[PDB]
């Protein structure tokens, strides 16, 4: 779906290598997605996806499988028949690769359309003592740069529904 992104890429070289790895969604655009708490999306070797998440009270722990494709910044998900509903063309639009991304995407599950969040998640910044507060002090510890790339995009972080809380 080249034709369903709404926005240019400000990483059309996009390192899938330096993109791979685990990452937490913070927050986006559909209010269709926030039934799905604290999603950590796991992108291995050459374009394995493990993803997995929540029900609104951390209980119906969830994961799907599935492959990618990556083209530069865009990138698509099949997901196993379990999943199907998220299958589909993303972007990324942003990215300083080691703290946070943002992506778009044309999910049926975000009613077709997304731009999200994400701050990577890995055990050196994180120490189960759980995951609401890590997601809000890497947000807030990149708030800056997220801000402005958001900006570029005409939208501000406090316009996007929070998905992990």
Same mark, same amino acid.
């Given at each position: 779906?080249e034709?369903?992104?709404?926005?240019?890429?400000?990483v059309?070289?996009?390192?899938?290598?330096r993109?791979?790895?685990?990452?937490?969604?913070?927050?986006?655009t559909?209010?269709?997605?926030?039934?799905?708490?604290?999603?950590?999306?796991?992108?291995?070797?050459?374009?394995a996806?493990?993803?997995?998440?929540?029900?609104?009270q951390?209980?119906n722990?969830?994961?799907?499988?599935?492959?990618?494709?990556?083209?530069? @910044?865009?990138?698509?998900?099949?997901?196993?028949?379990?999943? %199907?509903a /998220?299958?589909?063309? !993303?972007s990324? &639009?942003?990215?300083d690769?080691?703290?946070?991304?943002?992506?778009?995407?044309?999910?049926?599950?975000?009613?077709?359309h997304?731009?999200y969040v994400?701050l990577?998640?890995?055990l050196?910044?994180?120490?189960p003592?759980?995951?609401?507060?890590?997601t809000?002090?890497?947000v @807030?510890q990149?708030?800056?740069?997220?801000?402005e790339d958001? %900006?570029? /995009?005409?939208?501000? !972080?406090?316009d &996007?529904?929070?998905?992990?809380?």
């Open positions: 779906n034709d369903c992104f709404r926005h240019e890429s400000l059309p070289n996009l390192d899938y290598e993109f791979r790895g685990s990452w937490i969604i913070a927050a986006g559909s209010e269709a997605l926030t039934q799905y708490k604290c999603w950590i999306d796991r992108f291995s070797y050459d374009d996806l493990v993803s997995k998440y929540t029900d609104s951390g209980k722990r969830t994961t799907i499988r599935g492959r990618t494709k990556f083209e530069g @910044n865009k990138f698509t998900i099949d997901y196993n028949d379990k999943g %199907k /998220f299958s589909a063309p !993303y990324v &639009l942003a990215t690769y080691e703290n946070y991304a943002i992506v778009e995407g044309c999910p049926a599950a975000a009613n077709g997304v731009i994400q990577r998640m890995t050196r910044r994180f120490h003592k759980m995951l609401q507060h890590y809000l002090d890497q @807030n990149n708030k800056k740069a997220i801000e958001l %900006k570029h /995009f005409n939208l501000k !972080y406090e &996007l529904h929070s998905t992990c809380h």
